[PDB]
């Protein structure tokens, strides 16, 4: 029935825009036009004056403290994808254990889905908004931190010619986490059937909302695999980096 | 609005038991008596025997096993720290410093759920080491769990189950009272939602429980109390037994 889908549908939008504080649409705006722009970061002595304009909460060598910043935020990305988690349909009702599971593994697919949001070509926003770290400034972060970020952008660039809007997203951010092929699952079960559920909604959003885009929901679908690949990548990253006290429990 | 804070009651108690495998409700159902029936260590033999039947000279090594969970815990507690609203969100000194300070309070608060008058659950719950064995130890661990214990007794007459300790445990976290926190406001804004979250879910839970909510904040002096005398007893240790090894991530959370 189109009415329990679309109703499904305007029910995760408004939770994404509850638990998602910095939206696609706020973000497109503020890397289109103006009014009041972000502060841009492009070299050292622009990071430097940066940090004394935008107040980091992660300050405690600059490639490092980058790096830092990125592990920060993306703890803070978790606490907010936990929260969205828990409106869709079904998914508390799922074993505990599971629920765990479903997160762990898929929250680095939403980050990377959602960093696009706040990307472009030149570069990506960061501190909700108020700062533009340029993609060339990243590049030039010596090696191994030099390309951390490049494969994001790759991403991104692609994966935002969809033009996909607020409200697909949050139905496809919805898809990844009721992903019933993560490891450890104990009742497959209930995650297909709500991933099914999910999967139909989705479909008939992309249908309605960009009827002349020729089997978009296939080529969105296909993108799921560009993600996985970005993710067993960043994670090889992270074991190069772990070879070269509290914190440390924070960021596990 | 009593909504959001029964939400947020919710949460944390979904979180709770997502970071803590072993809840006080498992573990007085242990303690009850079953195929869940513990092995019980009360003399030198019986430590032994354990040893085979459960996952140096014997006080140390007993030390060191109190030393190994309290590595645990405090890997646990982080873990639930993250989950409660606006945590993540502070400035990251102030997260280290809130758990620095937060994290023996709270080992003792659940190490409570542990215990009765007559002893403490160990290793998850397949083993129980009486108090008498513990308070017979060679000397500075004689007492070393003692002062718990007296705690726990009082503590456990309250008869708080785990959905009123998530709550609490959250709001002893958030203290903006601890030394060399940089930004004090935004914690006690949680502080102030998490301790009305305190006060709904005590007046629900136990309707007949007269004036509980002030009971349990004052039990915050019995807690601090508690972890005054661990930390000196770690300095006798210290040079009573140089040959004797501290986890660092225990160090780093005493030494300051
Ligand atoms: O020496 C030990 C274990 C010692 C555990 C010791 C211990 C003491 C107080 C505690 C605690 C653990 O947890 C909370 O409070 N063994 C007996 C069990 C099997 C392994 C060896």
């Given at each position: 029935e189109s009415a329990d889908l679309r109703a499904l549908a305007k029910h995760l939008y408004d939770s994404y825009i509850k638990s998602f504080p910095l939206t696609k649409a706020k973000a497109r705006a503020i890397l289109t036009g103006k009014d009041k722009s972000p502060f841009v970061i492009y070299d050292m002595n622009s990071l430097m004056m940066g940090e004394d304009k935008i107040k980091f909460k992660h300050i405690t060598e600059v490639a490092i403290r980058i790096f830092q910043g990125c592990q920060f935020r993306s703890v803070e990305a978790v606490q907010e994808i936990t929260e969205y988690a828990?409106?869709?349909?079904?998914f508390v009702n799922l074993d505990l254990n599971d629920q765990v599971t479903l997160l762990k593994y898929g929250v680095h697919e939403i980050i990377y889905t959602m960093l696009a949001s706040l990307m472009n070509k030149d570069g990506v926003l960061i501190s909700e908004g108020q700062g533009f770290m340029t993609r060339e400034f990243l590049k030039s972060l010596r090696k191994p931190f030099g390309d951390f970020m490049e494969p994001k952008f790759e991403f991104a660039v692609k994966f935002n010619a969809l033009e996909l809007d607020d409200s697909d997203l949050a139905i496809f951010i919805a898809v990844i986490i009721l992903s019933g092929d993560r490891p450890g699952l104990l009742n497959v079960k209930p995650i297909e059937d709500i991933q099914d559920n999910l999967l139909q909604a989705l479909e008939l959003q992309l249908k309605l909302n960009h009827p002349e885009s020729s089997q978009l929901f296939a080529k969105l679908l296909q993108k799921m695999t560009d993600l996985r690949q970005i993710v067993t990548e960043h994670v090889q990253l992270l074991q190069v980096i772990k070879k070269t006290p509290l914190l440390q429990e924070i960021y596990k």
């Open positions: 828990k409106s869709i349909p079904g």
